[PDB]
């Protein structure tokens, strides 16, 4: 009884990195994949080595396929935090492991030198100010 309980009671990216049973990856040609491909940090560099060797398999075509891989396989998806918030919010069997690996944001893209860019920034700032970005987030993530 004690040997059962002590073992089944004593038991991050590192945990994924220092092992091989659990497959892990990211969306092909996305900023997350690029992050690992260009990371000079040992552990992330170790992980890129893993998912790039098992490339055709570790990397997924899109997030829906990655989420499905997490559901039907022993697989961990390297996904952005607000997307993870949306998923775990709808499947109590799923969870976010560890904290954020980096900090960044989503922005509207425009061709280089577009007159619309600064105007869009001003507009985003307005929507933020009047609390609509919050409302929009709540509407969709519910």
């Amino acid at each position: 009884l004690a040997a059962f309980l002590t073992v089944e009671r004593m038991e991050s990216a590192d945990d994924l990195a220092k092992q091989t049973k659990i497959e892990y990856g990211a969306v092909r040609d996305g900023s997350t994949m690029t992050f690992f491909k260009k990371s000079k940090i040992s552990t992330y560099e170790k992980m890129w080595a893993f998912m790039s060797s098992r490339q055709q398999s570790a990397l997924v075509k899109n997030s829906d396929e990655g989420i499905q891989r997490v559901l039907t396989t022993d697989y961990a998806l390297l996904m952005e935090s607000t997307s993870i918030e949306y998923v775990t919010q709808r499947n109590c069997n799923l969870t976010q492991i560890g904290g954020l690996i980096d900090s960044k944001g989503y922005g509207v893209g425009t061709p280089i030198g577009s007159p619309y860019r600064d105007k869009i920034t001003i507009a985003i700032l307005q929507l933020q100010e009047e609390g609509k970005l919050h409302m929009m987030k709540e509407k969709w993530w519910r």
Binding site: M79, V87, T95, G98, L100
Partner: peptide, 10 residues
Amino acid sequence: FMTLGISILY
């Protein structure tokens, strides 16, 4: 317009 970070879904 939104902030986030790379994390792990498992």
